UniProtKB/Swiss-Prot annotation, chain A:
Component of the Mediator complex, a coactivator involved in the regulated transcription of nearly all RNA polymerase II-dependent genes. Mediator functions as a bridge to convey information from gene-specific regulatory proteins to the basal RNA polymerase II transcription machinery. The Mediator complex, having a compact conformation in its free form, is recruited to promoters by direct interactions with regulatory proteins and serves for the assembly of a functional preinitiation complex with RNA polymerase II and the general transcription factors. Component of the Mediator complex, which is composed of at least 21 subunits that form three structurally distinct submodules. The Mediator head module contains MED6, MED8, MED11, SRB4/MED17, SRB5/MED18, ROX3/MED19, SRB2/MED20 and SRB6/MED22, the middle module contains MED1, MED4, NUT1/MED5, MED7, CSE2/MED9, NUT2/MED10, SRB7/MED21 and SOH1/MED31, and the tail module contains MED2, PGD1/MED3, RGR1/MED14, GAL11/MED15 and SIN4/MED16. The head and the middle modules interact directly with RNA polymerase II, whereas the elongated tail module interacts with gene-specific regulatory proteins. Present with 1720 molecules/cell in log phase SD medium. The chain holds residues 345 to 687 of 687 of the full protein. It comes from the Eukaryota. It is found in: Nucleus.
UniProtKB/Swiss-Prot annotation, chain B:
Gene3D superfamilies: 3.30.310.180. It is found in: Nucleus. The gene is SRB2. It holds the Pfam family Med20. The lineage of its organism: Eukaryota, Fungi, Dikarya, Ascomycota, Saccharomycotina. It comes from the Eukaryota. One of its GO terms (molecular function) is transcription coactivator activity. One of its GO terms (cellular component) is core mediator complex. Keywords: Activator, Nucleus, Transcription, Transcription regulation. GO terms for biological process: cellular response to nutrient levels; negative regulation of ribosomal protein gene transcription by RNA polymerase II; positive regulation of transcription by RNA polymerase II; positive regulation of transcription elongation by RNA polymerase II; positive regulation of transcription initiation by RNA polymerase II; regulation of transcription by RNA polymerase II; RNA polymerase II preinitiation complex assembly. This is Mediator of RNA polymerase II transcription subunit 20.
Swiss-Prot record, chain C:
Component of the Mediator complex, a coactivator involved in the regulated transcription of nearly all RNA polymerase II-dependent genes. Mediator functions as a bridge to convey information from gene-specific regulatory proteins to the basal RNA polymerase II transcription machinery. The Mediator complex, having a compact conformation in its free form, is recruited to promoters by direct interactions with regulatory proteins and serves for the assembly of a functional preinitiation complex with RNA polymerase II and the general transcription factors. Component of the Mediator complex, which is composed of at least 21 subunits that form three structurally distinct submodules. The Mediator head module contains MED6, MED8, MED11, SRB4/MED17, SRB5/MED18, ROX3/MED19, SRB2/MED20 and SRB6/MED22, the middle module contains MED1, MED4, NUT1/MED5, MED7, CSE2/MED9, NUT2/MED10, SRB7/MED21 and SOH1/MED31, and the tail module contains MED2, PGD1/MED3, RGR1/MED14, GAL11/MED15 and SIN4/MED16. The head and the middle modules interact directly with RNA polymerase II, whereas the elongated tail module interacts with gene-specific regulatory proteins. This is Mediator of RNA polymerase II transcription subunit 18. It is found in: Nucleus.
Swiss-Prot record, chain D:
Component of the Mediator complex, a coactivator involved in the regulated transcription of nearly all RNA polymerase II-dependent genes. Mediator functions as a bridge to convey information from gene-specific regulatory proteins to the basal RNA polymerase II transcription machinery. The Mediator complex, having a compact conformation in its free form, is recruited to promoters by direct interactions with regulatory proteins and serves for the assembly of a functional preinitiation complex with RNA polymerase II and the general transcription factors. Transmembrane segments: none annotated. Signal peptide: none annotated. Present with 319 molecules/cell in log phase SD medium. Component of the Mediator complex, which is composed of at least 21 subunits that form three structurally distinct submodules. The Mediator head module contains MED6, MED8, MED11, SRB4/MED17, SRB5/MED18, ROX3/MED19, SRB2/MED20 and SRB6/MED22, the middle module contains MED1, MED4, NUT1/MED5, MED7, CSE2/MED9, NUT2/MED10, SRB7/MED21 and SOH1/MED31, and the tail module contains MED2, PGD1/MED3, RGR1/MED14, GAL11/MED15 and SIN4/MED16. The head and the middle modules interact directly with RNA polymerase II, whereas the elongated tail module interacts with gene-specific regulatory proteins. The chain holds residues 340 to 696 of 1082 of the full protein. It is found in: Nucleus. It comes from the Eukaryota.
Length: 323, 210, 253, 322
């Protein structure tokens, strides 16, 4: 299902005259002619996580992807063809992953994502920094597990993309399989959306606490989340298994204010990220008049206007309590 | 369940549409994209027919409802599509369809031309659609071969509780503009089976008949 | 309306399994099960169509095909739920009997389709046929039914049959079908393709005027045929067998 | 280490010297220049496949007969300029030189237009040209005094926009170093739409008008949202002549329970530094497809500053306006 046209994944078998063993020579790398091919071609993908300090603008290395090595048994690896096959599969998969990451992040400049060189990409967050690098081989920190997890889910998302491509190809012959960058390529979008949605959720929690919880005592807050042939059904099942990760994050917060005279207004705020980066806050304020007479129902994209309307609502509630 | 009604005015003037557009301007909330509609009648060319078998067949083509044709004969409806995006995926997959169909009007007027022949054609283009409070009103001028024919009004609502009141209000609005000869209809083709577009086509047929 | 470019053939069931494997070796895709049900309708003889311009032959009467997909729950008997729903079930479909009988199909009563005899001349390497197609989505009224609709148009039922087989999707929009056909009557069900599978490889062209595309399609079909040389012989069927006009009666099966 | 055809060169040079009257040196120099140009083109071909400028940023056309390379960059740029570079043999020095064919670069001071050592640092030369073009555009914008200067960042432009009635905040606009389209740090849908509008803009006057309209309709959207979060505006009414009180915008609002044809009319007057609102009550009717200003009141015009308007004033006005 891969659309990577640069390499065909073809390896010629050569019986080593000196060692009486079998080696694999790839088609593309026909420039390196020597016994140092293994180390010269051994590339890898590294994820580095830097935590921004609140006192200085510099970033300190807080996590790095753990390079677990299966090549420690060099003599066994240099004579076992299966290990060479697995290593070559990993190399080509990482190359495709890096190319897809480049083509995907080329469109995320407007939200604070940049490309340093042909092998490095950088993602910035108000408190964090992520660096993804393709590097040649030539103390346990806090966030090392974080980087390993990031690498794992990136590989999983690439596999999901391949499965989607194969399913679309099998479904119909006429459909030209030309991937759309805006739609098909979804790798950094889910992770970035989750992180920024968590940041915005924390920010709105703080805003609500400052402007409502600290001002109006007794408010109750509740947090909720709102959701023939064997081969096609198998692929549908496997793809649907990843909905909880690929789907757009959502959050809902219901605030009930304790008021007398059997007039209890409700404040339901649902936070969404329709394009995986922007924050949309939908506010539904129901005054204590009827169960369906929604006093106000608005949408907001600027947190400043959110705070202004929250202050106005608090003032209106105070005036209602004063009358 | 949404409800719809159709009112046809035969003695209208060229400027009556503008008069009704302005007379409702106080309640007009918004305006949307224009629409079009086609209305053909096909005749039976065979003479050895029974007395109880009808001779006509009315074809109504809706342009805004995703390019769909409806064939009507003796209170019997048939809905055909011609877009590649309306095809149920099973028919594409199994091979029952080549994937790029044709409109049924081409079939009637090309291959079955020895059984059915065209008799008239009434068209409506560049209509206007207005969103009022819980209502959508569409207006258009009808043009036959000879020339201007009349005015067509179609009303669609989602809540069926107060449909009759809205119809009466629109009738009164036409009344102040002194359009006194208008034929309205909101009937339903089948009391038990409710299909929206079939009922709309039947209401069009009942309004446009002479 | 399409120009369908097609090639035909047949095989004995003995090689069936083997054939399947070879196809997967070429296309790189697995087969997908499918079924269908076709009903043929003809103009009513009770009505005299004098409108056929006898002195000019502007048009001749023809036959209409209505097709529909039927779920496998009607085709699987009580002995077969244990096996998974894949292609191997076709190996058990060698008997003239089938779970779907006349009464169920009568209870059923879509895609409407009309065709013409292939193009004349002996300089044609593939069967080129013209097809006009439309789709029926739903209906309503006091007599909403396919039979009542086709009687309203002026057509009556003639016969029907059931196809079961597998599909292969290759590059360039080429579709390869392996079929088994069961004719159905109140008298019973008879498998016309007895002890074998009917093979049909075809492509569709949307516009008949484009000739570069048609040349490309013919090139692909002849390349496919030249790939299968020695195993199965794909041939152009008889031009007089694919004629479906009412005046003359025969049915390629 | 190049595999030179030594014997063919021997016969060629011997024939030239035999037919020589100088010519050998000229032919050698021409061949050296042609080889350098060809290897520069080969380097361009190698880079374009995987380079940062692959996506339509740079296009190079090479002519052997004239032995010149034309490079076009920033195809989606209409700011009264077209990025063009010519690499060719200099007549005076008989050497291959690169010239950035731009009138803006022509009258630019203390900034070299012609560069050498193209083979060694072609990427550096391209980056320098990119940065110089961006700086020239930014300096022109600053000279027009539409964007204020950012002290912290020399490549970031500050645009002053009022987020609320009293707030007056700067927004950071940045220039893409690859294709050259202006972009915001955290653009809203309207902000993204107007950034896209800026991208295909053609004239400096067009750009100034675009920014003025951006400020105007941003204020209009803010106040319309303020009204709707508490009010039914009308988006259908267009008056032939603007109402007599520098950009003037008329907004016609009402409530369902108001008397017919009576509209609260707001005339927003926006200047370069200040904005005011004229609140009046009028009567408008529609006849034969035309909007007729049936009546306007001028003795009770409420002239209000932009900052002073608040929610409580809005609701008090709602109560008193009936």
């Amino acid at each position: 299902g891969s659309t990577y046209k640069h390499d065909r994944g073809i390896a010629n078998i050569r019986n080593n005259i000196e060692s009486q063993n079998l080696d694999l020579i790839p088609h593309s790398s026909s420039v390196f002619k020597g016994t140092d091919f293994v180390h010269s071609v051994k590339k890898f993908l590294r994820v580095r996580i830097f935590t921004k300090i609140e006192s200085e603008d510099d970033y300190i290395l807080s996590g790095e992807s753990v390079m677990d090595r299966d090549s420690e048994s060099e003599e066994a690896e240099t004579k076992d063809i299966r290990k060479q096959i697995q290593l070559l599969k990993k190399i080509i998969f990482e190359k495709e992953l890096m190319y897809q990451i480049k083509k995907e992040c080329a469109l995320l400049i407007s939200y604070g994502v940049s490309i340093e060189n042909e092998n490095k990409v950088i993602i910035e967050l108000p408190n964090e920094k992520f660096e993804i690098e393709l590097l040649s081989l030539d103390l346990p920190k806090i966030n090392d597990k974080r980087a390993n997890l990031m690498l794992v889910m990136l590989r999983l998302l690439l596999v999901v993309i391949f499965k989607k491509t194969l399913r679309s190809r099998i479904s119909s012959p006429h459909g030209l399989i030309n991937l759309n960058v805006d739609d098909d390529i979804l790798i950094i979008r889910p992770i970035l959306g989750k992180v920024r949605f968590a940041n915005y959720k924390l920010l709105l929690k703080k805003i609500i606490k400052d402007y409502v919880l600290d001002i109006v005592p007794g408010s109750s807050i509740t947090e909720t989340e709102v959701e023939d042939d064997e081969n096609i059904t198998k692929l549908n099942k496997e793809i649907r298994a990843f909905d909880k990760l690929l789907n757009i994050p959502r959050r809902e917060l219901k605030i009930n204010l304790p008021l007398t005279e059997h007039k209890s207004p409700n404040l339901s705020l649902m936070l969404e990220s329709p394009n995986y980066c922007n924050a949309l806050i939908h506010i539904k304020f129901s005054a204590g008049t009827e169960a369906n007479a929604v006093s106000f129902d608005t949408t907001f994209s600027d947190f400043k206007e959110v705070e202004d309307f929250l202050h106005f609502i608090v003032a209106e509630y105070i005036q209602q309590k004063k009358v | 369940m949404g409800k719809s009604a159709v009112i046809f005015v035969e003695r209208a003037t060229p400027a009556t549409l503008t008069e009704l557009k302005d007379a409702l301007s106080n309640s007009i909330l918004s305006v949307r994209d224009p629409w079009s509609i086609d209305f053909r009648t096909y005749r039976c060319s065979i003479k050895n027919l029974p007395a109880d078998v009808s001779k006509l067949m009315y074809s109504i083509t809706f342009h805004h409802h995703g390019r769909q044709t409806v064939l009507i004969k003796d209170n019997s409806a048939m809905v055909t599509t011609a877009a590649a995006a309306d095809i149920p995926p099973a028919l594409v997959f199994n091979g029952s369809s080549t994937g790029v169909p044709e409109s049924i009007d081409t079939i009637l007027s090309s291959k079955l031309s020895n059984i059915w022949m065209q008799r008239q054609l009434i068209k409506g283009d560049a209509g206007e659609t207005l969103i009022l409070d819980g209502l959508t009103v569409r207006l258009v001028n009808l043009f036959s071969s000879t020339g201007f024919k009349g005015l067509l009004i179609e009303l669609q609502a989602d809540e069926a509780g107060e449909f009759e009141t809205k119809i009466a209000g629109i009738e009164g609005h036409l009344a102040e503009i002194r359009a006194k000869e208008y034929k309205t209809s909101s009937d339903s083709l089948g009391p038990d089976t409710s299909n929206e577009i079939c009922d709309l086509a039947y209401q069009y047929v009942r309004a446009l008949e002479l | 309306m399409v120009q369908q470019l097609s090639l035909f053939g047949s095989i004995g069931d003995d090689g069936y399994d083997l054939l399947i494997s070879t196809l997967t070796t070429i296309s790189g895709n697995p087969p997908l099960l499918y079924n269908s049900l076709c009903t043929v309708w003809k103009p009513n003889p009770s009505y005299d169509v004098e409108n056929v311009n006898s002195r000019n032959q502007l048009v001749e009467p023809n036959r209409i095909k209505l097709s529909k997909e039927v779920p496998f729950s009607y085709l699987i008997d009580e002995t077969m739920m244990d096996k998974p729903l894949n292609f191997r079930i076709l190996k058990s479909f060698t008997n003239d009997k089938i779970p779907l009988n006349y009464a169920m199909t009568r209870n059923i009563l879509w895609s409407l389709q009309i065709s013409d005899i292939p193009a004349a001349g002996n300089n044609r390497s593939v069967s080129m046929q013209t097809i006009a197609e439309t789709i029926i989505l739903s209906s309503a009224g006091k007599n909403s039914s396919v039979s009542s609709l086709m009687n309203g148009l002026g057509y009556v039922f003639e016969f029907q049959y059931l196809t079961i087989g597998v599909k292969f999707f290759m590059k360039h929009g080429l579709i390869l079908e392996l079929q088994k056909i069961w004719q159905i009557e109140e008298a019973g069900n008879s498998q016309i393709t007895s002890g074998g599978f009917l093979l049909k490889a075809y492509i569709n062209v949307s516009r008949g005027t484009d000739i570069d595309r048609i040349n490309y399609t013919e090139t692909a079909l002849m390349n496919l045929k030249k790939e299968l040389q020695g195993y199965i012989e794909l041939s152009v069927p008889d031009r007089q067998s694919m004629d479906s006009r009412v005046a003359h009666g025969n049915i390629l099966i | 280490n190049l595999p030179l055809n030594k014997p063919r060169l021997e016969k060629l040079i011997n024939e030239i010297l035999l037919k020589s009257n100088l010519s050998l040196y000229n032919f050698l120099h021409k061949y050296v220049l042609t080889l350098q140009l060809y290897m520069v083109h080969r380097e361009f071909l190698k880079l374009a496949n995987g380079g940062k400028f692959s996506k339509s940023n740079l296009i190079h056309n090479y002519d052997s007969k004239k032995s010149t390379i034309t490079v076009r960059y920033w195809l989606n740029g209409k700011m009264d300029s077209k990025g063009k570079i010519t690499i060719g043999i200099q007549r005076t020095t008989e050497s291959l030189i690169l010239k950035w064919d731009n009138q803006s670069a022509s009258r630019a001071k203390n900034m070299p237009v012609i560069y050498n050592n193209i083979v060694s640092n072609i990427e550096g030369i391209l980056d320098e040209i990119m940065f110089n073009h961006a700086r020239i555009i930014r300096s022109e914008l600053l000279a027009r005094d539409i964007f204020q200067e950012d002290e912290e960042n020399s490549d970031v432009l500050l645009f002053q926009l009022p987020t609320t009635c009293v707030s007056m905040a700067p927004i950071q606009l940045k220039i893409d170093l690859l294709s050259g389209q202006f972009y915001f740090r955290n653009p809203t849908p309207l902000l993204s739409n107007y950034a896209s509008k800026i991208n295909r803009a053609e004239g400096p006057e067009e750009l100034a008008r675009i920014l003025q309209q951006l400020k105007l309709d941003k204020i209009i959207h803010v106040l319309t949202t303020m009204f709707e979060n508490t009010w039914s505006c009308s988006r259908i009414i267009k008056i032939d002549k603007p109402i007599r009180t520098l950009l003037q915008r008329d907004l016609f609002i009402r409530l369902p329970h108001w008397p017919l044809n009576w509209y609260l009319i707001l005339s927003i007057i926006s200047s370069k530094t200040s904005c005011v609102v004229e609140k009046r009550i009028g009567k408008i009717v529609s006849q034969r497809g035309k909007w007729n200003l049936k009546y306007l009141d001028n003795s009770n015009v409420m002239t209000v500053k932009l900052e002073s308007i608040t929610y409580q004033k809005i609701m008090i006005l709602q109560r008193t306006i009936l």
